[PDB]
Design a protein around this ligand. Structure first.
Ligand code: ATP
Lengths: 144, 49, 49
């Protein structure tokens, strides 16, 4: 609660959330996932496959809240962040992906992170810490 | 393990100081009045450090 | 968004983590077996360090 969010992070967060929501829809697509109304896991139908616009607003709210909580924890661990350049934000340029590996969503998910992308051991440890922090929040929810 | 952590920037500037001292001692030994041996020992221990 | 992380803060346990308030248990032979003369030997096997 004491954490305050910088304006670049507010402006980035909404499309960050919709893009990551898409990222899970593609991860389950490549896991074998075909859309349906009912929420059954065994039958393989669930309504959340759809885009953020047709995404139910209550799951959308939890997704935006968990994005906000993740970034606030990231600031709460003392890791500062800034804008490197506007070009890496503007460009989403990628070689075209097959329709089998793509959904009806137009923009291709993955950027061109082939070898340049890298996380130092401190980044990997912080990823770990975010993992048990999210797990602890979930555990408190189940305790409640 | 408690302390004694020499800073990375501190090590950087220690290496810079060693390098500039090596540049200073170079080509200028005759000016020094036999303390060139003391300067050699200083550069030596800087090398070990 | 190049996130600049703080340097990894190294923490030393330094015997802080410990059970209860009792620190060490001392094991000794009976007082009647005290040696007043002679040359004696016994072994102590260290299961852990
Ligand atoms: N915090 C959450 N916010 C939104 N949806 C969630 C949340 N936690 C779980 N879900 C949803 O509930 C379902 C449970 O799947 P989830 O991804 O959590 O793992 P799982 O492998 O099915 O295992 P588990 O039974 O442990 O949840 C999924 O449909 C998931 O989207």
């Amino acid at each position: 609660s004491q954490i305050v969010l910088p304006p670049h992070l507010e402006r980035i967060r909404e499309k960050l959330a919709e893009n990551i929501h898409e990222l899970w829809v593609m991860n389950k697509i490549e896991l074998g996932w075909q859309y349906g109304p009912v929420r059954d896991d065994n039958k393989r139908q669930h309504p959340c496959l759809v885009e953020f616009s047709k995404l139910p607003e209550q799951e959308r709210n939890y997704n935006l809240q968990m994005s906000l909580e993740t970034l606030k924890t990231l600031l709460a661990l003392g890791c500062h962040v800034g804008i490197s350049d506007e070009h890496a934000e503007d460009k989403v340029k990628k070689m075209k992906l097959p329709k089998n590996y793509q959904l009806t969503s137009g923009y291709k998910p993955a950027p061109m992170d082939l070898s340049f992308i890298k996380l130092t051991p401190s980044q990997e440890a912080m990823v770990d810490k975010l993992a048990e922090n999210a797990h602890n929040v979930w555990a408190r929810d189940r305790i409640r | 393990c408690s302390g004694g952590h020499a800073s990375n920037k501190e090590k950087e500037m220690v290496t810079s100081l060693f390098c500039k001292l090596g540049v200073l001692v170079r080509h200028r030994i005759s000016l020094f009045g036999n303390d060139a041996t003391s300067i050699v020992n200083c550069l030596h221990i800087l090398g070990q450090t | 968004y190049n996130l600049e992380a703080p340097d990894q803060d190294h923490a030393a346990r330094a015997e802080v983590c410990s059970g209860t308030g009792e620190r060490f248990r001392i094991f000794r032979a009976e007082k009647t077996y005290a040696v007043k003369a002679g040359r004696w030997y016994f072994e102590f096997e260290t299961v852990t360090a």
